[PDB]
Amino acid sequence: SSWLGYKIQEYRLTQRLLEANNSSCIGFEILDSNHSKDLWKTLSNWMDLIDSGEIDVDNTIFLLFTSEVLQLLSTSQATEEASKAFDEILKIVSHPSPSIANYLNNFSKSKTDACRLISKFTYIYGSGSAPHDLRESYKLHRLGALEEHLDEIMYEILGWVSDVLTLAAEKRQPTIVRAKDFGARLGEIESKYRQKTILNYFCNRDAPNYIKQLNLINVDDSELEEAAIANLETKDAVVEWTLNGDVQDYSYRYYQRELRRCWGIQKQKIHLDFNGRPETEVGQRLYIECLNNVTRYYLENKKVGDFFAHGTLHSMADKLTIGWHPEFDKKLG
Amino acid sequence: SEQEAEITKRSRDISNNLAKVKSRLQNINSMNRLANTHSDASRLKRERLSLSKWLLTQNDINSSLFSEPNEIRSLVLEPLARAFSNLEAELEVPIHVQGALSREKIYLEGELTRLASEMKDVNTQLKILR
Amino acid sequence: DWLSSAQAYVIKAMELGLVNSDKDIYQLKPERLLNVLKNIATKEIDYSTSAANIKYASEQEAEITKRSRDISNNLAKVKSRLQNINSMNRLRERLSLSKWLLTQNDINSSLFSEPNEIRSLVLEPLARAFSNLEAELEVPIHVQGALSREKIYLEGELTRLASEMKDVNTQLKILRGNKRKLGYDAFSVGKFVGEVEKALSLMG
Amino acid sequence: QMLKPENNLEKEAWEINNPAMCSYMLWIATLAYYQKQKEPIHPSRLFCLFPFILYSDTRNVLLSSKGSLKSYLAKFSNSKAISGDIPLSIHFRIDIQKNKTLDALIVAFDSGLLVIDSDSGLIKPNVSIKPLPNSKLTDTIKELVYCSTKIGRWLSEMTNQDLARDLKVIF
Known about the structure:
The complex is a heterotetramer, with 1 copy of chain A, 2 copies of chain B and 1 copy of chain D.
Chain A: H1 8-18, E1 25-26, H2 37-45, H3 47-51, E2 61-65, H4 68-74, H5 79-90, H6 98-107, H7 111-119, E3 121-124, H8 130-141, H9 151-170, E4 176-177, H10 179-195, H11 199-202, H12 209-217, H13 221-243, H14 251-274, H15 279-291, H16 306-318
Parallel strand pairs in A: 1-2, 2-3
Antiparallel strand pairs in A: 1-4
Chain B: H1 2-49, H2 52-61, H3 72-89, H4 95-129
Chain D: H1 8-14, H2 19-37, H3 49-53, H4 59-62, H5 70-77, H6 92-96, H7 98-109, E1 114-116, E2 123-125, H8 139-154
Antiparallel strand pairs in D: 1-2
PDB class: dna binding protein
Keywords: LmuABC_Apo, DNA binding protein
Assembly: tetrameric
């Protein structure tokens, strides 16, 4: 599906964060024997969390990755089964080592807190179908599906999940990740990879030369969308004007030559002045000082819109006639 | 105070992000209108260009008045027929493009509500510390 | 005239102000629209920016900008026929297509670059038949029609649509302002009131 | 001639005031001229076609009109009495569209659409080539072909003298 460098560690965490609604999936706590130290090390780490009130609002989810006790913690959803599991863990064997006793004696502090810890617990393992499970869960669980390109979206959200997993694992806190922050990050990834790779691909057309000459300046996507809608609106205005015969069909030659004059004037004005800036920066300055100019200019000796000047500048740059980057003819065409 | 410094820093961040979100919503409404506007303009262009294949066939089957081989057909007419053939396929907005436009519109409405709530509670904390 | 400046400041006073104004601004009465700016200019509190107000202005600005190009497509047609009015009072002249076809004989073609094909078949037969009309109806037949009423009406068409540009483009300038700087912090609202009180300094 | 111009703006103008359509509308107006009297059309009549059909201040009035000669001319002057600069602009739209008409003749001169006769300069259409029926047209061509036939039949009763006073054009 995605780039499969991420293991099941990130896959099951992202899948369980996908099927949630503002409920923080706390403490992945990777474990790799009924009397093992790391088990009660992990359940002892969640003591101060539920003992405090800044993290648990009685909506958190606790779970484990990779024994009779594990089934006792996993297979109990209600309070009475949690009580029965608590009495079974409290009477299974005598206290073998102090390294587990120091966690067990405080684990037996409160019956109700332990019962709510069991009621939110669900130990899971996962398998090799975890990328397929994440793919199917995102396909049939996400409202407003983005099925045309979901591999790279899952790649970015798995990169975010792996980054927060490493940031939680390197330091001394458990894996506290909320579904709200996960939903915000997945929404940002979805919006970034819908507004650009498909939407902006429809309304600019295989990377035409005007959008590439914009890309040489590497300006933000708001100017990219403004340029695309200006070019489309200018082409549609030409279509409307020559359908109804408003302007004669050679005044675009007198409009485009004058624009060559203004582009040469602004190029001498802004390229000779600095001569010590980066090429992209002086190209950005030339582009903005061209756009705030060439707006009072007349097509067929009458007033024309701002959108027409911007779109004819972009269509003029599309045929490699004018440019924004100082080195643009060697880069393309 | 440094608390006022970080509060003003995050307020500037949220203000610039809301400015970008409003600009993106204005753009996405512009493309939402421009999809059907460019579809209508392309339909009118296709209607004006639909005689080109017929004139291509009557160039193929008839005898011209020009004795010397001229490339007027090769440089004029099949450009128009090729434009007709391209505009036949590039007329209608695709369903996934319109769906992505609508999903981006409702998502930008969602971030408008979210960042407006963020605006509301940050200006409350400004007006309670000052 | 005035209400363009009033309505543009009211719409941006819901982006950066304390008024919600659930009544529709397009159908709002002018006398209601002046009390909204007095509330912003007198007291500046409860900076409640909401998405229901911001999303209304994006459709309001896009409807105003759509109305801007429809006036310009109508302002162009008034200005295009005004030049044909002004060409009438200075007069008509002979078009002389037969002499005009000879200018294409002495000019480059670049498509049918061989000059022995088009001149021997098309442009000289078109010139000789056009030269017959320069010797048949060469008498100056009078041209009438009394186009003085078109000068009066298109003066009224020009003084209405250009008056709309001095109103509509005022609404674009207030609503856009700086697309680099549409700030939503406390400093942007504080400098917004100074622009509002300048426009209301001239009520009489 | 107009090939595809090396501008993106002027290419879109070229695909609408296009020379394959413009050589078809001249052929239809020649066919409406040749049907009435079986006489070759004087080449100054075909120049006046594009002032009518390639604009909108005329072409939207030919669709409403159904009469002949001054019945259209009353529809600007006295039938609504609000405009009337439009039929005086037909003389000026000769010079604007002389560059559009002249090479629309040339594409019509190839492919057996319009045939000129020797050095006399008389255009005859190809009656052996069947035109498109009104069913197989599109929406915009159904307006223009009806406009081309209507102007092509109005000029059949137009001699050399009354073009200078009714159409107000002098060549």
